[PDB]
Amino acid sequence: NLQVYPLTPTFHDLYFSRNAKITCLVSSMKTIENFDISWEREKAGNLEFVTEDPVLHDNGTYSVASILSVCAEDWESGDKFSCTVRSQDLPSPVKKTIFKQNEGTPKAPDVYLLPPSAQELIQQEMVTLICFVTGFNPKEIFIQWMQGGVSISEDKFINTVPMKSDGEQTYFIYSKLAIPAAKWNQGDVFTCVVGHEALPLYITQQSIDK
Amino acid sequence: NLQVYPLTPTFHDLYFSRNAKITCLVSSMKTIENFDISWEREKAGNLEFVTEDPVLHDNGTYSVASILSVCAEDWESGDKFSCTVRSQDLPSPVKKTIFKQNEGTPKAPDVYLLPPSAQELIQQEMVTLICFVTGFNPKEIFIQWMQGGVSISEDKFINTVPMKSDGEQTYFIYSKLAIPAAKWNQGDVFTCVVGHEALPLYITQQSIDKSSG
Amino acid sequence: NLQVYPLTPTFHDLYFSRNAKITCLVSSMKTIENFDISWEREKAGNLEFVTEDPVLHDNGTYSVASILSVCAEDWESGDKFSCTVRSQDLPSPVKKTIFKQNEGTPKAPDVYLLPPSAQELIQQEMVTLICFVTGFNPKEIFIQWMQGGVSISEDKFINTVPMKSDGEQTYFIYSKLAIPAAKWNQGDVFTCVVGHEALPLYITQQSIDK
């Protein structure tokens, strides 16, 4: 009976898309009657309480998510945003408070773009361009791909979990972009843009070509 | 109250370390009396039934592990192996079966060792050979490193979680080898050796060095 | 009247084929009546007993072989397995011990693959690639050939007997591949794979091209 999963806004939605969504997802719910979600902020301000209809998720139970529209300055100022669920399943409400947790000194990630080595003979595999970016101290990172200015869709590249480097507090993530071998042989530039809050400016990209 | 956490032996200890040891880890417990586990097979053979003493793990509970020494030939044949835990906290014994589950048609991994790129001025984080190996259908890879014959220690390199390439059931995994820049500049050959059960022979090694052409 | 022919399982069948079989072949026999073999093991375990039907070999004598399946962990550990044959010809039963005996300190073989000689001209259909692998102390070896990724069949290479080195306990064995002369000039990578116990990981392979 794990009901509420509070999802922090991602960095790609916080600054580079400018929509800070704080969502309280009531994952498991048994009844719809006498059920509501009340938002609250420790600082006086607007409260765009938006909720979704219950749907049959998990083991056929109800799943409701409450979406709050907050300012990107408001979440990054250290304010505490709380959602208070209450229903017949829960004897007592759980005040789930969402805020930007500091994780020590942030470190700017170091983007390294890996060109394919001499095994690119086959048409699809090993033509993948791997964006080994490492060193970022907070886990909130986003990586996109561009082939000369135009963005590449999310299906063509797949990222990993930002695993923690051993011995250090810094993390590391790989971003591979599967492209046809003909595209890499055309000599066009491929830019791996890496967005992170610890960079001097929140965009830093690396460009490689044959 | 999630008592039974079973586990399976990986590919490295099944063929290249021979420690085919299925373990029935009972992580969460409340009582230590009137509790025992019995190891049983669906085929006749040996029962090297070994149990560990409970230890204070998790949220201050008792964690019990029961290790059974089995032949690797019986494990790969799909022999059903069930640990039967039973205690006062369980109204009925939990008999969870452990066996080699097939996951479709196995596909041979394609090992691809990648040299560090052009900004090799710094000493550690750039100079990291990445053993990108992809296309293995069972998610039971094991990757080791050797600087020529001698095995690199199991803490200089960190693997990732084998995750599916979106579109097929073929996984992919990396392993960066954190080495100093001076070590790479010696011209010594770094070999990434990769072992998987879908390979024609269960070891494949990819070797690169500075100016590998 | 040399009845018992023990046969240890080869290393290739021990690990990389899993068909670890111990056979007490009885080539020379007189009467098949009142004859049976009772296998036994030093440590308690399963006795996968099977005997193939007698056949006419040697100088008109019936050949009886009893195949027993062994765990590779139950043969590497040094457990002694003995077959106890008993026939009308033998006045007393023969208890021949079959086990993985020690040969010495196991030394890892040194695989040197040799390109074809400068006389790759007059002679074609036979540019021979020699896999000189030497230095292994236990003479249990298996050598296969791989063209790229696909394996070469066992009829296209012939291996010498493991020959002792002059003045040492180490051995050396030769493996030649009789590939066509046109095949060598394509530039395809020919790989000789050598399997030995004393190797860190039991498969070690070397490869070259033109």
Side-chain angles (χ1 to χ4, degrees):
Chain A
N1 273 313
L2 274 74
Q3 290 84 19
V4 179
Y5 276 93
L7 297 168
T8 70
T10 54
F11 186 59
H12 172 40
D13 302 322
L14 184 63
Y15 267 59
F16 283 95
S17 314
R18 298 296 299 278
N19 203 23
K21 299 289 94 175
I22 299 186
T23 70
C24 283
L25 167 64
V26 190
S27 58
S28 175
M29 189 57 221
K30 302 211 297 288
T31 54
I32 60 169
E33 61 268 31
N34 205 4
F35 154 73
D36 56 334
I37 300 152
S38 171
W39 276 105
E40 192 60 90
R41 305 177 41 183
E42 79 166 2
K43 184 179 289 294
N46 198 288
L47 268 170
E48 295 216 81
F49 160 60
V50 186
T51 192
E52 292 182 28
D53 270 333
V55 288
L56 310 178
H57 286 356
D58 289 331
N59 208 353
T61 55
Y62 309 136
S63 280
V64 188
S66 83
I67 298 170
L68 185 58
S69 296
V70 296
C71 310
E73 184 179 1
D74 265 359
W75 187 39
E76 272 193 341
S77 76
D79 290 338
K80 303 269 168 62
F81 304 87
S82 78
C83 63
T84 55
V85 301
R86 162 195 52 247
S87 58
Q88 306 186 357
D89 180 34
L90 304 177
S92 170
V94 179
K95 187 181 177 289
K96 282 288 185 185
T97 304
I98 297 91
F99 67 102
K100 196 190 189 293
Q101 288 88 11
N102 55 4
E103 193 272 329
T105 61
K107 191 174 174 308
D110 297 288
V111 191
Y112 308 113
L113 205 43
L114 280 189
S117 64
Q119 290 92 306
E120 79 276 34
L121 315 179
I122 58 175
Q123 70 273 18
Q124 194 68 270
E125 299 199 328
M126 187 46 200
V127 176
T128 73
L129 261 67
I130 283 166
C131 197
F132 181 38
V133 62
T134 182
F136 50 97
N137 211 324
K139 273 182 274 193
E140 298 97 3
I141 202 182
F142 80 92
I143 300 153
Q144 298 190 341
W145 284 87
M146 304 163 186
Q147 56 172 109
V150 294
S151 287
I152 301 171
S153 175
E154 297 286 326
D155 284 330
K156 286 185 89 176
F157 67 95
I158 171 163
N159 313 326
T160 61
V161 182
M163 290 184 68
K164 208 195 286 156
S165 191
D166 59 356
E168 299 320 297
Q169 203 58 35
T170 77
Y171 297 85
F172 65 98
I173 189 168
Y174 314 84
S175 196
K176 61 175 287 294
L177 171 79
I179 54 171
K183 275 204 191 166
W184 173 245
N185 291 316
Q186 284 172 333
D188 46 0
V189 67
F190 270 102
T191 49
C192 168
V193 63
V194 163
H196 193 254
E197 80 167 332
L199 276 159
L201 277 170
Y202 320 108
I203 293 299
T204 296
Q205 71 257 13
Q206 292 298 113
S207 60
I208 63 167
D209 45 349
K210 180 184 68 212
Chain B
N1 271 314
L2 282 72
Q3 280 84 22
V4 192
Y5 291 167
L7 59 90
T8 69
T10 186
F11 195 49
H12 168 64
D13 50 18
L14 197 76
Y15 273 69
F16 301 87
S17 296
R18 313 312 313 236
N19 296 306
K21 303 284 210 73
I22 54 173
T23 307
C24 197
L25 177 58
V26 190
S27 63
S28 80
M29 272 317 285
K30 183 78 51 152
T31 175
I32 59 168
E33 61 259 38
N34 209 359
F35 156 71
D36 73 318
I37 319 170
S38 196
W39 271 111
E40 297 278 15
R41 328 184 45 187
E42 60 91 21
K43 285 290 183 69
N46 287 302
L47 267 71
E48 280 82 5
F49 162 73
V50 191
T51 51
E52 280 185 22
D53 290 330
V55 286
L56 199 74
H57 290 356
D58 269 20
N59 218 11
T61 49
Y62 288 96
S63 292
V64 192
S66 74
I67 301 163
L68 172 61
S69 183
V70 75
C71 292
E73 269 86 353
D74 298 295
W75 168 262
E76 77 164 3
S77 78
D79 288 341
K80 310 289 187 177
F81 272 108
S82 296
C83 51
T84 58
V85 308
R86 168 192 59 251
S87 69
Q88 297 179 359
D89 314 333
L90 262 173
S92 179
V94 179
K95 194 176 177 289
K96 282 172 76 177
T97 315
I98 299 95
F99 76 106
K100 195 187 190 294
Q101 284 102 4
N102 46 357
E103 195 272 329
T105 70
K107 190 180 167 309
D110 283 330
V111 191
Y112 295 125
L113 188 41
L114 288 151
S117 57
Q119 300 92 352
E120 64 260 358
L121 298 173
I122 56 176
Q123 72 277 16
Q124 292 295 145
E125 64 184 359
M126 150 64 84
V127 188
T128 46
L129 281 73
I130 293 183
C131 194
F132 178 47
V133 55
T134 176
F136 50 98
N137 189 359
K139 51 177 291 293
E140 208 169 10
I141 205 75
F142 84 93
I143 298 164
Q144 280 198 3
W145 286 84
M146 291 188 297
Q147 209 167 353
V150 56
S151 292
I152 299 295
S153 78
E154 301 283 323
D155 54 351
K156 276 153 104 171
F157 70 97
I158 172 168
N159 306 325
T160 71
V161 184
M163 61 184 293
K164 281 177 279 293
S165 287
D166 51 354
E168 292 93 359
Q169 281 306 102
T170 73
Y171 292 74
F172 76 97
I173 187 174
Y174 316 86
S175 74
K176 51 179 281 287
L177 184 65
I179 49 160
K183 283 204 189 163
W184 172 247
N185 293 317
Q186 309 296 104
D188 50 354
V189 169
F190 289 87
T191 64
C192 178
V193 62
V194 174
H196 193 246
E197 60 191 0
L199 287 165
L201 291 173
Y202 308 132
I203 291 297
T204 306
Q205 50 192 4
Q206 271 273 322
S207 50
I208 64 167
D209 46 349
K210 183 174 73 175
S211 293
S212 79
Chain C
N1 271 308
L2 273 79
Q3 264 74 30
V4 286
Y5 285 168
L7 290 174
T8 68
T10 176
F11 177 70
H12 164 83
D13 274 329
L14 207 62
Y15 281 70
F16 295 120
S17 296
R18 291 319 210 206
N19 284 310
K21 296 310 176 294
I22 297 191
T23 62
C24 283
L25 163 68
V26 190
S27 64
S28 178
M29 269 281 269
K30 290 216 287 292
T31 53
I32 43 173
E33 49 264 37
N34 204 358
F35 155 69
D36 205 4
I37 310 175
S38 307
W39 274 97
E40 66 94 21
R41 306 160 90 263
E42 189 174 2
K43 266 87 157 183
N46 202 294
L47 276 161
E48 293 291 329
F49 165 62
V50 62
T51 285
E52 62 188 7
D53 269 333
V55 288
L56 198 71
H57 288 349
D58 271 11
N59 216 1
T61 51
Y62 316 129
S63 293
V64 181
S66 81
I67 308 171
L68 188 153
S69 311
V70 286
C71 296
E73 291 99 5
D74 277 334
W75 197 74
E76 181 197 5
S77 64
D79 303 336
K80 298 177 178 62
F81 299 150
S82 75
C83 60
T84 56
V85 308
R86 174 194 56 246
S87 77
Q88 296 190 353
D89 168 49
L90 276 297
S92 171
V94 189
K95 187 178 181 284
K96 261 282 193 180
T97 311
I98 309 104
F99 73 113
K100 185 187 187 293
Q101 71 267 22
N102 192 9
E103 204 266 352
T105 67
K107 193 181 170 315
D110 281 318
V111 189
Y112 309 101
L113 193 156
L114 292 163
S117 297
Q119 281 84 352
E120 43 200 313
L121 295 52
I122 61 171
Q123 173 64 39
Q124 293 177 335
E125 289 318 285
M126 183 176 282
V127 175
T128 299
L129 264 79
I130 288 171
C131 200
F132 181 37
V133 56
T134 183
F136 53 98
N137 192 21
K139 52 175 265 177
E140 292 292 323
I141 201 74
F142 77 91
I143 298 149
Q144 310 176 0
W145 285 89
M146 310 215 299
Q147 182 178 334
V150 60
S151 68
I152 305 289
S153 191
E154 272 76 16
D155 308 309
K156 296 179 128 204
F157 57 85
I158 188 166
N159 297 359
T160 64
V161 292
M163 184 152 295
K164 193 174 201 265
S165 175
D166 199 80
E168 215 168 347
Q169 206 40 60
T170 70
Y171 289 64
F172 67 95
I173 188 179
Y174 278 107
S175 192
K176 62 170 277 279
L177 201 54
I179 50 161
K183 278 212 200 165
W184 173 245
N185 295 126
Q186 309 182 341
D188 43 356
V189 161
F190 277 98
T191 303
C192 171
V193 62
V194 168
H196 192 252
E197 313 177 355
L199 288 161
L201 294 162
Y202 311 114
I203 283 301
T204 295
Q205 66 193 11
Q206 286 255 309
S207 66
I208 53 153
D209 48 8
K210 199 254 174 161

